[PDB]
Curated annotation (Swiss-Prot):
Residue numbers binding a 1,2-diacyl-sn-glycero-3-phospho-(1D-myo-inositol-3,4,5-trisphosphate): K13, L14, G15, G16, R17, V18, K19, T20, R24, Y35, R45, N94
Gene for this chain: Cyth3
Superkingdom of the source species: Eukaryota
Task of the protein: Promotes guanine-nucleotide exchange on ARF1. Promotes the activation of ARF factors through replacement of GDP with GTP. Plays a role in the epithelial polarization.
Domain PH, first and last residues per copy: 4-120
Cellular localisation: Cytoplasm, Cytosol; Cell membrane; Cell junction, Adherens junction; Cell junction, Tight junction
Subunit structure as annotated in this protein's UniProt entry: Interacts with TAMALIN. Interacts with FRMD4A. Interacts with FRMD4B.
Free-text domain note: Binds via its PH domain to the inositol head group of phosphatidylinositol 3,4,5-trisphosphate. Autoinhibited by its C-terminal basic region.
Result for mutant: R45A: Abolishes phosphatidylinositol 3,4,5-trisphosphate binding
Shown chain mapped onto the complete sequence: 261 to 387 of 399
Result, substituting K83A: Abolishes phosphatidylinositol 3,4,5-trisphosphate binding
Effect seen on changing N94A: Slightly reduces phosphatidylinositol 3,4,5-trisphosphate binding
Lineage per the UniProt record: Eukaryota, Metazoa, Chordata, Craniata, Vertebrata
Name this protein carries in UniProt: Cytohesin-3
Length: 127
């Protein structure tokens, strides 16, 4: 699944119910954003399918180079996603938005472009 990735790199992500920022290694592939706690981890911490989502730039009080993934068709609608819990649970995400912070302005632009291209490339886009 992780072979032939569209982009890989470190990004800071804001939590769902609990609003805490975590540094995660992201992998964009198969029109999904997989994230890992550590780069060499065998298992992803979570997966965010990009189908039906949009991206928009945002300004954050503390974190620079931010953007958000959100569902444009249904405001306030929880984004379909799946992640693991320390106790072993595999559960659905609780995010209405995914606020992400990139390491640099350039990396923000590259990530936003890669994600948008992935979403548009999907043959089942807007269906
Ligand atoms: O560690 P604490 O301070 O509790 O914060 C956690 C982490 O930010 C998790 O991120 P990660 O999974 O990358 O570790 C996040 O899961 P998401 O991955 O869904 O953002 C949790 O979201 P909730 O389960 O919605 O609270 C949030 O509670």
């Amino acid at each position: 699944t992780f072979f032939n990735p569209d982009r890989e790199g470190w990004l800071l992500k804001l939590g769902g119910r609990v609003k805490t920022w975590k540094r995660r290694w992201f992998i964009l592939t198969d029109n999904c954003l997989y994230y890992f706690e550590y780069t060499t981890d065998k298992e992803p911490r979570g997966i965010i399918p990009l189908e039906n989502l949009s991206i928009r730039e945002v300004l954050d009080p503390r974190k620079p180079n931010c953007f958000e993934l959100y569902n444009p068709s249904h405001k306030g609608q929880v984004i379909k996603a799946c992640k693991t819990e320390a106790d072993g649970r595999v559960v659905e995400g609780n995010h209405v938005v995914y606020r992400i912070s990139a390491p640099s302005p350039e990396e923000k632009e590259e990530w936003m472009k890669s994600i948008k291209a992935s979403i548009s490339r999907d043959p089942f886009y807007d269906m």
